[PDB]
Amino acid sequence: HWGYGKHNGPEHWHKDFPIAKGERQSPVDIDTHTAKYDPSLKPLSVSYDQATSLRILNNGHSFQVTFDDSQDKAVLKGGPLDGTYRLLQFHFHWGSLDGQGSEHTVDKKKYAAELHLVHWNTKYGDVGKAVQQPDGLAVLGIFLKVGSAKPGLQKVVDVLDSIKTEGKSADFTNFDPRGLLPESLDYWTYPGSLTTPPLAECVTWIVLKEPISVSSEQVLKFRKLNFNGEGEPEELMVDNWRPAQPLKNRQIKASFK
Ligand SMILES: [N]S(=O)(=O)[C][C][C][C][C][C]C1234B567B89%10B%11%12%13B85%14B%1158B%12%11%15B%139%12B%1061B%12%112C5%153B%14874
Ligand SMILES: [Zn+2]
């Protein structure tokens, strides 16, 4: 199966998922000087007050916290979006060292990690249906830099020892994702894709300008996870990021001057 290694990594994915070479792939480099300020973009509306987290899972490519998306409890609205998008899960991409790990880049700068909060458009009823639509998904992307600890991330970090290997999961109730957001909701937006197989071109990307800071001890715990199943040779889950893809005929828009 696909992965992030020499033999199965991003430059190989097009063989099983030919859309990898498509017209609206993600991530991209965000050239801050070429992004156009669009004064008609609305502020983003993040309503996570009623979010219900369920489980945390090592899926062999990242770890994810999954939410109850059977009602409008944690939704994303406004911004460049038409309609209501329910929060399904969040996960991260990170590096083997602090100088890489983010999928989006800003004027070619890589961050140590990138948080993706994945939402789907309720007009399509379910995520499987939504990934087949050009406005099916909205992913809120947040950069992580290394410095001060993020207190709101610690509950996550502390359970990772229990989901070390691919397929392990644990109960992960009462986690509040509001503790992962930066102060500002200023953002860049562009039409793109999933950054993992199946690389479906169904995503409105919303990438926040302001990074969150996490501690070296927090990111070090991400790097103790494993790509492999229990009983297989130990391969650390590091560098699980797709490089920037060609922008082609797309315009990146900014919410802010
Ligand atoms: N890195 S990122 O934020 O761009 C990743 C978002 C991927 C969200 C998952 C969507 C599906 B999973 B399950 B099936 B497999 B295929 B169908 B169903 B869920 B929807 C699709 B894949
Ligand atoms: Zn992601």
The resolution, in angstroms to one decimal, equals 1.5
Indicate which residue's Cα is closest to atom 14 of ligand 1: 128
Sign of CA dihedral 28, 34, 38, 42: positive
**Integer Cα distance of 228 and 240 in angstroms:** 13
**Nearest atom in ligand 1 to 242's CA:** 1
Residue 139 β-bridge partners: 118, 205
Tokens matching residue 78: 């406004």
CB of 117 closer than 8 Å to CB of 53: no
**Integer Cα distance of 46 and 85 in angstroms:** 10
**Integer Cα distance of 55 and 154 in angstroms:** 16
Rounded to a whole number of angstroms, the CA Rg of the chain reads: 17
The 3-class SS string of the chain reads CCCCCCCCCHHHHHHCCHHHHCCCCCCCEECCCCCEECCCCCCEEEECCCCCEEEEEECCCCEEEEECCCCCCCEEEECCCCCCEEEEEEEEEECCCCCCCCCCEECCECCCEEEEEEEEEHHHCCHHHHCCCCCCEEEEEEEEEECCCCHHHHHHHHHHHHHCCCCCEEECCCCCHHHHCCCCCCEEEEEECCCCCCCCCCEEEEEECCCEEECHHHHHHHCCCECCCCCCCCCECCCCCCCCCCCCCCCCEECCC
Give 195 Cα–ligand 2 centroid separation in angstroms: 6
Neighbouring C-beta atoms of residue 210, cutoff 10 Å: 13
Residue type present at position 36: K
Give 209 Cα–ligand 1 centroid separation in angstroms: 24
Neighbouring C-beta atoms of residue 244, cutoff 10 Å: 18
Residue of 1, 7, 12, 61 marked active site: 61
CB of 42 closer than 8 Å to CB of 77: no
Q: What are phi and psi of 124, to 5 degrees?
A: -95, 0
Q: What's the domain count of the chain?
A: 1
CB of 206 closer than 8 Å to CB of 142: no
Active site residue 61: yes
Q: Which domain holds residue 58?
A: 1-257
Cis peptide before 27 (omega within 30 of 0): yes
**Integer Cα distance of 58 and 102 in angstroms:** 19
CB of 20 closer than 8 Å to CB of 199: yes
Tokens matching residue 33: 């000087």
CB of 67 closer than 8 Å to CB of 180: no
Residue with tokens 């709101």: 152
Q: Which one, of 120, 102, 87, 130, lies nearest residue 195 by Cα?
A: 102
